[PDB]
Amino acid sequence: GLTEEQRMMIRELMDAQMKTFDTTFSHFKNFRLPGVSREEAAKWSQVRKDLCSLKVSLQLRGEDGSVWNYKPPADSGGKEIFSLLPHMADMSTYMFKGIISFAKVISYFRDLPIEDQISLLKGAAFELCQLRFNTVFNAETGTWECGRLSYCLEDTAGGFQQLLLEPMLKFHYMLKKLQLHEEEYVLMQAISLFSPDRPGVLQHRVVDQLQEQFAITLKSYIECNRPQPAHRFLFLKIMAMLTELRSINAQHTQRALRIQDIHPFATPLMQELFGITSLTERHKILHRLLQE
Amino acid sequence: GLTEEQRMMIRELMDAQMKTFDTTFSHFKNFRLPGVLWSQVRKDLCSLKVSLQLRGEDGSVWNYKPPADSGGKEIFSLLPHMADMSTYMFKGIISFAKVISYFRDLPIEDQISLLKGAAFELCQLRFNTVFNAETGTWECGRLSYCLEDTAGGFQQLLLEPMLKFHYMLKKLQLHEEEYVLMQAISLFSPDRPGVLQHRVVDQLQEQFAITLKSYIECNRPQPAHRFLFLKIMAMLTELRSINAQHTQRALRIQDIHPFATPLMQELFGISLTERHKILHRLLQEGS
Numbered sequence: 001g002l003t004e005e006q007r008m009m010i011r012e013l014m015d016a017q018m019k020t021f022d023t024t025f026s027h028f029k030n031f032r033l034p035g036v037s038r039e040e041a042a043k044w045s046q047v048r049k050d051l052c053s054l055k056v057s058l059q060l061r062g063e064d065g066s067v068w069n070y071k072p073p074a075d076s077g078g079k080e081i082f083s084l085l086p087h088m089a090d091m092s093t094y095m096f097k098g099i100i101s102f103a104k105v106i107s108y109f110r111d112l113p114i115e116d117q118i119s120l121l122k123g124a125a126f127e128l129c130q131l132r133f134n135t136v137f138n139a140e141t142g143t144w145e146c147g148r149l150s151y152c153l154e155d156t157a158g159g160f161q162q163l164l165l166e167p168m169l170k171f172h173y174m175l176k177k178l179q180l181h182e183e184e185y186v187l188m189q190a191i192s193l194f195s196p197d198r199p200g201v202l203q204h205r206v207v208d209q210l211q212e213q214f215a216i217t218l219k220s221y222i223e224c225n226r227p228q229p230a231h232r233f234l235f236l237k238i239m240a241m242l243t244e245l246r247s248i249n250a251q252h253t254q255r256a257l258r259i260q261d262i263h264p265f266a267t268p269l270m271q272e273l274f275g276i277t278s279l280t281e282r283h284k285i286l287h288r289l290l291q292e
Numbered sequence: 293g294l295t296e297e298q299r300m301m302i303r304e305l306m307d308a309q310m311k312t313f314d315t316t317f318s319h320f321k322n323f324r325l326p327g328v329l330w331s332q333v334r335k336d337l338c339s340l341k342v343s344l345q346l347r348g349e350d351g352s353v354w355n356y357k358p359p360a361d362s363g364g365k366e367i368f369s370l371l372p373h374m375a376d377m378s379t380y381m382f383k384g385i386i387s388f389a390k391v392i393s394y395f396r397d398l399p400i401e402d403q404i405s406l407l408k409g410a411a412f413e414l415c416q417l418r419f420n421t422v423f424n425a426e427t428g429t430w431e432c433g434r435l436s437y438c439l440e441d442t443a444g445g446f447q448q449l450l451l452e453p454m455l456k457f458h459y460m461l462k463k464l465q466l467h468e469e470e471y472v473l474m475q476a477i478s479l480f481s482p483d484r485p486g487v488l489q490h491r492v493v494d495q496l497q498e499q500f501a502i503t504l505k506s507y508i509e510c511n512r513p514q515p516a517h518r519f520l521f522l523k524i525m526a527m528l529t530e531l532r533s534i535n536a537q538h539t540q541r542a543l544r545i546q547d548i549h550p551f552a553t554p555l556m557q558e559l560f561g562i563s564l565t566e567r568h569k570i571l572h573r574l575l576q577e578g579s
């Protein structure tokens with residue numbers, strides 16, 4: 001029931017996803033692991049609050065059948081709270097490079113000016129990484145299954161209710177419950193990627209028209225491939241989830257900047273995304289990875 | 293009821309133990325770990341199957357579960373690590389003997405022969421003092437070694453003689469003084485290979501055993517501790533037998549998969565000073 005142009009748009013996105021999403025995480029290697037004033041004190045108090053909501057354990061399953069498991073330390077008012085940040089910095093950097101490659105395969109992104117390509121990727125990096133993370137999230141176990149690596153949420157005294165307080169966790173549980181198709185995920189990525197209101201975008205009207213066509217394709221896909229009355233508001237549910245993900249991005253980017261200020265963890269590519277010291281001069285690694 | 297010489301002998305051994313047993317294992321570092329990624333041999337290597345817990349100062353916990361047996365080299369996953377732990381324990385044993393006055397006055401080659409013969413036994417006796425029998429775990433400070441479940445429960449595990457020894461010795465509820473006297477009796481064994489001053493070592497061994505018997509009579513009056521001295525002596529005789537069996541196991545495993553540290557190879561080798569140059573150096577050094 002889709003136009004052929006809509007069918008070709010989905011084929012290009014799905015082809016982009018197939019070439020750039022390492023679903024098994026087999027090529028994620030050489031990552032770090034946790035080892036075997038008053039205004040400054042107010043900074044450390046906010047950071048401790050940020051790191052407490054997303055507590056996870058790390059399981060690494062070996063080829064031989066052995067299992068290494070890392071339980072995080074409880075907070076003792078020290079730097080133990082940053083134990084898993086180097087590993088997560090390597091994981092985030094590995095995910096974003098796949099995101100950069102994803103966008104480059106899309107023709108509409110390639111035809112944009114390089115400065116708008118940077119602004120869009122800078123604005124949607126966290127969101128496309130979270131959207132890809134949702135497809136490997138097991139809601140029954142609260143575990144992100146990244147091939148041999150596993151990230152299991154820790155049982156905070158309170159259960160599901162206390163975890164749902166955190167907007168990041170509620171997002172992953174709510175998005176998983178919609179049981180989306182691969183095509184719907186990749187259309188969510190395109191809609192998030194081609195956001196006209198990202199800071200620094202200049203071709204606003206072109207990006208807005210592209211986003212509209214991606215959203216119309218998603219709306220039309222749901223009408224054609226889902227039972228019509230039950231999924232009558234599925235598109236609007238997806239759009240509300242994307243709007244909430246944009247809010248979570250701003251909050252967590254602010255969290256990341258505060259942590260980076262007192263404890264530097266970000267990789268050089270992450271520093272470009274966060275704004276740490278012209279768009280091309282400010283983001284020289286991203287420019288190179290887009291010019292390849 | 294102990295003689296003044298017996299009281300001083302217990303005091304020197306207890307002082308020796310305090311100075312040379314790192315119960316916290318705080319100075320055990322730079323050890324190999326399992327990497328991130330035959331009938332009776334494998335049957336025992338499976339009975340002695342343990343998980344490794346590493347607790348960091350911050351409160352974090354690294355846990356290693358061993359691979360299940362599919363033949364292959366998975367059975368040897370923790371052996372390199374266990375060789376480093378054993379070598380660290382034996383270095384503490386060397387220091388324990390060096391501070392004892394009766395040992396340092398022996399010829400250096402008999403010091404080598406005695407340490408070579410009692411190395412496994414003295415390490416097992418120290419390991420028993422950190423063994424939690426209800427949890428089946430050797431609690432070595434930040435490191436923990438927890439036995440893995442197997443088919444037959446306690447009955448199948450008790451088949452392994454080393455595991456049976458640890459459970460039986462823990463049941464006797466021994467005091468530190470009794471452990472350190474068991475160590476002395478094992479250390480000053482006249483019948484160890486290569487010993488020349490047999491008579492002097494035999495006289496030393498007898499006086500350690502007499503002190504242990506006298507200590508038990510003076511401090512252990514309950515019906516629970518009846519025949520306790522003779523039970524301990526029988527346990528030492530059983531441990532000497534287990535030493536021979538497990539030393540042969542180690543030589544067979546070393547032949548097919550090398551795991552031994554350089555100091556362990558000197559112990560396993562069958563002049564004495566030239567044969568054991570590392571042990572010779574550690575004995576010549578000070579405390």
Ligand SMILES: CCC[C@H](CC)Oc1ccc(C(C)(C)C)cc1NC(=O)c1nnn(-c2cc(C)c(OC)cc2OC)c1C
Pocket residue numbers: 051054055056084085088089091092093096122125126129133144146151168252253256273274
């Ligand atoms: C494998 C899934 C893990 C789960 C999944 C939700 O996550 C964690 C789970 C636990 C932890 C703890 C470290 C334990 C607190 C962190 C995280 N998670 C991050 O450390 C993260 N997740 N995304 N990002 C990130 C990535 C990019 C490109 C970016 O560019 C603007 C900005 C980013 O943060 C603002 C980042 C930096």
Ligand SMILES: CCC[C@H](CC)Oc1ccc(C(C)(C)C)cc1NC(=O)c1nnn(-c2cc(C)c(OC)cc2OC)c1C
Pocket residue numbers: 337340341342370371374375378379382411412415419430437454538539542556559560
């Ligand atoms: C804290 C552990 C206590 C448990 C209880 C026994 O042990 C294990 C439990 C499990 C495992 C597995 C690796 C899992 C099979 C091994 C071991 N144990 C050793 O790997 C060992 N234990 N002692 N020794 C040793 C030490 C010396 C000086 C020596 O000198 C001649 C010869 C030795 O072996 C013949 C050695 C080499």
